[model samples]
Target: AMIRKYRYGAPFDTEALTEKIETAEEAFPYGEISQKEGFAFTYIMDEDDIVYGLGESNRGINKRGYCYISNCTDDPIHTEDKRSLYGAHNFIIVSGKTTFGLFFDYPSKLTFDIGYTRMDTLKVSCENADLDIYVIEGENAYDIVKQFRRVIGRSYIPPKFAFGFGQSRWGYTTKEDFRAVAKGYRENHIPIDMIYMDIDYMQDFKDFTVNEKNFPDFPEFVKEMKDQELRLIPIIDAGVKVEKGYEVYEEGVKNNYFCKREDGSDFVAAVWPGDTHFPDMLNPEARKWFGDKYRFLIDQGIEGFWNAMNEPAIFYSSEGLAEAKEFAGEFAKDTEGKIHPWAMQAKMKDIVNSPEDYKRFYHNVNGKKIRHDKVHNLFGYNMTRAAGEAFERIDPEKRFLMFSRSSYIGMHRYGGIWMGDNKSWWSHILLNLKMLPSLNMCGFMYTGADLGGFGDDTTRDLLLRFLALGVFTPLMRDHAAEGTREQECYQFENIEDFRSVINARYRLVPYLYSEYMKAALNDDMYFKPLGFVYPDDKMAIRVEDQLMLGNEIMIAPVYEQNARGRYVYLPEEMKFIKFMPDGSISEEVLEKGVHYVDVALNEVPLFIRSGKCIPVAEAAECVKDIDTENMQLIGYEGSSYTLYEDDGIHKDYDKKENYRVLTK
Candidate 1:
């Protein structure tokens, strides 16, 4: 194989390259370079490289591992080629004649690709322009950093309260149950920033419609939430039920808004509602219709939305084919050319055709030039875009929160996304450490896992441990499947005595919020791999189990079951402080920066770099209702942080109404 090797900090097209070599040593070295594993980096020494945000990927940054790159034709697992594995909004810097790319992979494999080509060279231009150019060469560690610098010149400024605590409720719970949890946060002085309501609040699992029986006074409930200063964001599934009478479905059908069958009938499938039809969000008209539907909920005091099942999760539909025969049950077709249930009086029309026809027909209706196999992956992306556009039009001035379970590239521009269907095992908790940075690198900055797993029951010990680590993620939400045990703090009062789990998060809110502000404004990442900050450090690129919270704090969450400790690998010459279970810290210095540190069952290890300031807030039952007037600072070493503040809901900020950047 011919390897193209490009020098780091070198100029492009000969002239600048000559300048760099001639004055290289004398012209302010600019940055140092490091190499290790299969990657390399170049750090701009003169740049004030504050950790603005972090990104996530499937594998570890700094380590050579595999990631399932989404939205591609090949299987994510099969196409393990690193070069084809690009993700989220990574930041790069172009200085002198070199460009540097920065991102974190699973197992901590950070790739800093250096290039001598200008941004224009990478551009797709007219006849004379060559679109594909390997302007830089060599996979050495230094080249990676140069590449990152060439691409991401600056970082984003994040939102402030985004750093605060959050809570969640799944399924159909009574209103009283909701109040109890909200009351608990208030009584406990826990600073809660957001309260998420899952699908149970909807009627018959319908999107954007409330269950009248349970939420008869939905408006009043929101009013109460407002009085409490809590934000009530609900989950909205992408699947729309196929009932002709339902207003949403009716409007979609009437406007030809729903995805179509191959023959142009309304496209229907099975989901929470057995017979469900999805909207053709890829079409601008369908997106506009879906956005208009939000008017009903927007009037109901809903602050945000959680887009679930946007992957358009089809049950038992392998290869994108719908098994209509299963639903028809040996049925016959009706006069209108629709299949009728076989269990009922048999008809000739429905029973004769095979299941593949149903699948083919519905898949064809989704979009122009779209098919079941080709379009399935894009469902989540389109759905997210619809919600973002709708929310923007509904209330254009505020920051709207829409955390999704399934997403693709560019999803970050609209809202947040959570890692899907994780188990309750501690490894999953630990896995989130790698997951956040991986997704962050892919431009999905507001991403995290379901704390304590959604499928399994979490014990008090595990819940506390998960919560402690959850505090550091960009978007934190405690969620579980219906069968899982309850996670209300009251159930685990005994664990609360330690105060370290909840209080520590409260204290870190300022820092977290500050970093989030950077994400919102400057498009920087909130979750990051060690290599993102210490790009020149070979050790930082390989540690997947551990991650950096913004640029200041490094967290090594416990991933093993009943395991009391885990090893963390740090970059060269970095100091660490061990936070004990009792809220005490002990400093430890290591030669190789890799060591197995003791962490009790009740403790998670956090290392805050020196000269960093962080913000803190009281935990509350609901985030939207909490009064964030009072906040505390942590790790104050005469370092200042910029805190971005604005209403979590509504669009007033865009109008320059009321936005503040608090520096501490």
Candidate 2:
């Protein structure tokens, strides 16, 4: 399935962002390419058509009925009414009357109104017309995704240990805070592998400096965690602390590496730090220099980093502050605060990550000065790309965990992505499920949401249900924010309920890890909708609740609140295995079609497809302890299953040393 490239205006050289793809032709296919304001085309959808893709979006797997803005945003209130979240991924597949994929290689803001204004029309309009539109034709939906995957590149593969449970909280500030977390999980016998270092771990919330008083002798602390089979991952934010004597900021300032104002002075904004400068990551040299800065902590035994606030999230620009204050002054004179206080409140709330402030700043992209709003979505992608590009240069032949809060299509090759600032809501569980296949389509297999949700207080039931969903997510982590209720598995009552689902994560690690590797190595999805597996089942196509994992398993998790069971629409007859809370599994054979399956809070529900076999292992607390060799096979006896193998720590995963095929 070769891609068809249609070049419109003098397109930006974003093609370099992808590998050299051997295309079939340069002719346009779907509709007319008009050359008005910016390029746009309308594709008519049939009544049964399902529009999918637009990575990390707010809607369902079917992205119709909404006008989505492909601008990488920093907002956290993930309500369905919102249009954008993190990451500006511009690849989508139209799967109704005509099945094809569209990847917009544009850095600026893009608009995709999929059946919103007009019911049958999907109008993709963007201001930056100078971008590549790659049209990939496939026989079906999954084939179109495969064709899109090949054009971009293979997905980022994390170390095997990354698959284990991660414990993170914004308030884990002091050494005792971390040690108490490690102690709580260990003493409670919960399986854990990684302890996350939030913004509190940094010195004055700076980029590269550690708070020595909080985490003294950091390298020694790293070793202690390593001994406990735990990896310490810290947060690396977008803004460098604008302080004198700070080496990262000073270095960036001295080399003219920071982004500039339209008049040529440095652009300044505040984030976690008081006032900060952004490294011009669009410039290759700046991206390289900023990326190499990770070595500061890498040399200190840090192997993982989560890049933050690079939607270049602004707290308040220097100019914006002045504008707000002046407006407040005028409003005070009018005495409007007595009646229309909404005006004053709106002015203040817009201070952070403001649209006006974004318009004021500029970026240096390949020697050309461009407006920040024009290339805003690319900020986080390049910053993470900075570190990803650096990992190859600094720690050659080794893998490190690198993911970003904001990303473009090319960022997928460099790192994984975490669903940013989701809340502790029941609906979020379903949202997490629907996002997997769409993200896989855009080439990000190593990704997951904050397990129990990031912003709000998570209930015991909420966390338990979230863990069931996280069990199959590649990067399984339980992260919560400051001021939210502590969501550590040990903190909940009936700790075994937490342990039951968490243990299931470890028990299935053998099969889960292999499927993840196969997906990455083969340019396939680690998770898919049942529709992709059973195209004929309109019931399955409509059932977004169920997903197919690997070749043998289908999972229909209980996403609704207070539901003892969920009605699963199995496309075919299959074996249902409930990985229960008390270190046991309950299996039953059921005929294909809809059935009400019981799922207690402490149990995880998954299905094995008919006549397929996959391996299962005794639950291990960590990857190093997992017994993959001595494993039990669970299935209805099928043909040989090929298990892909590689030393998971190395960078050249492009080459697999051995692959074993075992038959039942």
Candidate 3:
């Protein structure tokens, strides 16, 4: 039986709840107080226990005690006060007894009226008098699973290419070097769908310009990628180097495309390239100007963009780059003509000078630095917002694919993001598993950490383990810092193991895309925590390694080497079929439901619920067309599922021209 739950209603009386309301014992742990306008929320968690969301800052998601979750604002990149929330819709809070989360829409500053209540129950508009209520209930966990079933709804399905495997040559020094990696995939029968180009591919670290020396034949390079059936994705940053004669800056200045100071001069900062001014993404003209830069790359066969430093992270100090000090002009000074950057450095000794120094410098120079404390964190959001919007304008009807290294709350609506600068450690691999569910709960349906850590040494065992975990992730790519151990899967000594992992990723594409579509359509979390589906099951809340992909499959990756087995919790006595190394099937009969299962490192433990026809793609260098010819169906005890596949790219799927949805 369902009933009405209300908190506030139309024609509300504010005084009604004032007398009855009381604060919970969960007063935020941190005594720090934050107030904005008439609304306020206090910090409640230790900096260490708090897990920052992905792409919110340069370091990405980590246990590093400081995380800023506020509306996106401009300030120095590393400062805690500069932390912000933009494009973020919600944050989940998972309790030991009850598993649920709170969704806050930053734009409206309103918490979601709907979330989980119990395993079989959902609460919408719960006791909030001003909000509406929608409820879902199931007789059991399986019944509750169907509460979010529908093909098309609020979210958009990403194209097929998004599901295919991706290859990156971040350290490549020349175009030939990039093509050699692509060629290796073709030779080894590895399916490579997308290739990522890092900052080295650009000229002078410019956002849009190609390095003619390394890419002398830009048009030819595009054709080569197209011919190889691989999509080209290049990195784009927010910083604009302010060389007086530089074409990009000159055009932006002449056209008034850059952010202006109080006196209408361009607002500048120092970045990788010294003496730079950023286009005010907050301004419409600035966004358009930046997006238009993509035209050149799009003309040369680029299909996607990787937005780096959208946090607009600046590396320059007050003195500017040692080699380019002549370009910084007069540094910002106070009424006493005192340079703030030098003063802060002298006092803090590089400890707190980063964000504070930039804020003061930009404030005195720009003269419109009001609310500096409140808005410093959102600069990344504004930059990404501008970049994503620009790309969408380039192609409105189709899904635009882009990846950001820094993000805020609502970034999911714009593009995908990667956890930044991670070290290649076994613990980081485990951390990736724990973070994905939380990231998904926050509405970032498309998310992943670098396959192998991003920095330091990576052992063969660690790489193998990371690849095993990546097979089930939404966005999977192997990345690491320069001069570290090489990370190409083929580089492994055990070719058979590498092939198995790569093939698993390819076979799971259709199923992965189906789940991705659900996230886009239902506003459902794709990389879901076990507790989300099994809210009443206390054991599931703490189990982080095993996660739900959509509502059907449970992927528990084996991250340990010599363990020979792992434990996974089943919320119910559901049937599971194991796909073994010998290509044989074995079914498990459960009694208590919660138990440990033995699985070797060479094998992946994947369970498809009794019903559901999952789509699987064939292994190839790349997928140009939707290959539904190779699909698999897994039916649960007397139930059936549907699988969909279409061309990897383009809008052919919408027209049903080359698409298939098979029901089993």
Candidate 4:
């Protein structure tokens, strides 16, 4: 691999300071840099060039005819035209005449237009002049991705138990509510490991404070749940309520830790907590202060957490709200109810989560006040970093289970990320599958989408089909929005069907966990596009519906609704295993080529590579109940598999001598 660095202006040492990559001064390869208003770089693309690796962005594996922005956002709607999502992976690979990759280490908002504004032109623009660009040349696509991964450090590996199926919904509020959900799972014989507590569990939606009314004896509740072998993971938002008496707010104000406006006053925004202030996570002292606050919950036996809204999702900024109210007051009298309800609704909704609101805030980075828009993508990354860095100081020995709704490349080393706020659409199922390989390329191994979708209602068949795909994801958690129909597996009529699907996930825990660990440790991908494995095969390049899990199994989930089956393209002759939700398996050998195979709603389609083995465990209620002592190894002749084991709670695996790995 050949790496060349290009530095323009006084670029922030984002990658270097984060220890993500080493720095070296070198000459620019792509010619003169242009800086009219912002820094822009232009490169020519061939008609056959395949552009991949934007991490968590919209559209297909080959990013073409779309413009993507590197700004972390809390966008619930995942649309094709939407440029930014929850992550900013400023990495792209161009595969055509030659294979090369580009990594932009800029915290500010950057734009990449690939055949969007112009045909055959790839233009990249950063909002600020401070930028560090690294160009990597490799013999093949996989080799380039591997080189990038090695430079960025190892991906985060959650505790072994996190691989098990998790149950979550926004409305599990009271103590009885949580217990009842756990009871429902146990009574229905469904396998679950973790249950999530959303914003409802917070006292007045405040960070780090549990509601005394809803969850009386919080610490005891945590312990009792642990006794049942179920983990309670709560959500922590980026906003701290501006109330005077609240200790978190008090400390933030007293220490001047909150993000400030141009006048040096604390900038105010409204989120779940009516009026709130965002912490200047860019500031070291602020990050330490905000991160140390997690001790309140950690003391209560909370081992896992999901950091949310750290795109710092603003329902409305104080300035924007005032302007909106003024506009509405005048328009209400002038229009005199002349406007349609839909028109008025659209006008009002635009101000709620407006991009203009983000520009009003400022972050203190190394004694320099920078506009939030200039470094918008780094907000969630730094917020999660604050918590993760604190975890190192607080626990020191344990691996905390944490994933964020928004993230960037540097933050992946700290925690995993869930594709933000996806809806329950069949198209999203395919969207979820396509993003895994792209995310893996940028060093995010322990990641997944909100299973069964987080917004809108989910049907029983859709949930079941999604679960089939979710089974292979590292973080297998089913979640839905508050107002959405209750989509938990046990809530559906065919409880047995849901149970069967979850059981398959539990049964494959041993193999999935081992592969996940191996991928992280070896700087490899747990999920891969067919093209990555079979570069020479023309059919593999266009195949996206089916993906390889580890090196042994290929999963082609039926992602469409009301469809009994889907087409499976085999790059080579492989063994097909139809895994029914009832725990029965039917095997068949199929030749290489295209075939439309029939798959039932209650079955998950899996294909085994010619010579490989998969390890399975008996279905259990949770990961703790899974008995690794007795297991079934099934596959073709001369097949073998590796099993990795450890305490499952600690970071002792960082030492090769501490963990045990056995191959059979």
C-alpha local distance difference test of each model: 0.54, 0.85, 0.55, 0.85
Question: How well is each residue in 1-664 modelled by candidate 2, as lDDT tens digits?
Answer: 3676666666656532466644446457886666586678777888889988888888788888998888888899999889888978898887766788888778777889899998988888887567777888888889988878877887888887888889999988887888999999888888999999999999999988899797779899889888999899999999988999999888888988998889988899988888999899788888889988888999988888898898988989999889889988887888545636798888889898888888987778767898888778888888888898899999788889888888888788889999989999999999988888888888888899998889988899999999999999988899999999988988878897887888899988877888988888888988997778998877888777878999999988888889999898888999999887778888899998879999999999899888887777887787788887777777787556767656668855555454777677
User: Could you arrange the candidates by TM-score from highest to lowest?
Assistant: 2, 4, 3, 1
TM-score of each: 0.71, 0.97, 0.75, 0.96
Question: Candidate 4 versus the native: TM-score?
Answer: 0.96
Better of 1 and 4 by TM-score: 4
Model 3 over residues 74-155: C-alpha lDDT tens digits?
A: 3322323333433333333323222222322232223211111222222112112232121223343222222322211132
Q: After superposition, how far is residue 99 of candidate 1 from its true place, in Å?
A: 10
Off by over 4 Å in 1: 1-59, 62-162, 316-368, 497-499, 572-592, 610-664
Index of the highest-TM-score prediction: 2
lDDT per residue (tens digit) for residues 1-664 in model 1: 1112233331112110111211112221224333332223334322322222223334334322122222211112211243322222233223223433322211111233322122122111111111111222324323443333233232212233444566775753678867876887766655566677877888888887888988898999988866776667788887788776788888878878777766677765666775777787667778778867877887987766777766565442222332345444434445565654453433223332223422453332333445443333355666777877787687666556666665444455666777666667766676566667655544566667777777767887777778777867767767777766877555676645334565556555545665666554544556666656676665565456777766666777777767777787766434455445455555554444668777776564577666664555654333343445766545534666555555544333344433443345
Q: Give the TM-score of candidate 2.
A: 0.97
Clashing pairs in 4: none
Model 1 TM-score, all chains together: 0.71
Cα deviation at 429, candidate 2, in Å, is: 0.4
Candidate 4, 1-664: lDDT as tens digits: 3776666778765642233444566546653467897898888888877888988888888887789998887789997779988889999998877568988889878899888989888898976778888888898788888888878888887988898888888888898889988999988888888999999999999999999887779999999998988999999999999998999999998988999989989999999999999999889999999999999999999988999998878898888788778767766776566755666567678777577877887888888888887778888988988999999999898999999988888788889989878999999999998999999999888888888888898888889888999989998899999899888787878798888888888888888888888788888989988888888888887787888889888889999899999899998878788767668877888888998888888877788887776777888888988888778766786777667676788766666653443343
Model 2 stretches astray by more than 4 angstroms: 15-17, 21-27, 336-339, 652-657
lDDT of 1: 0.54
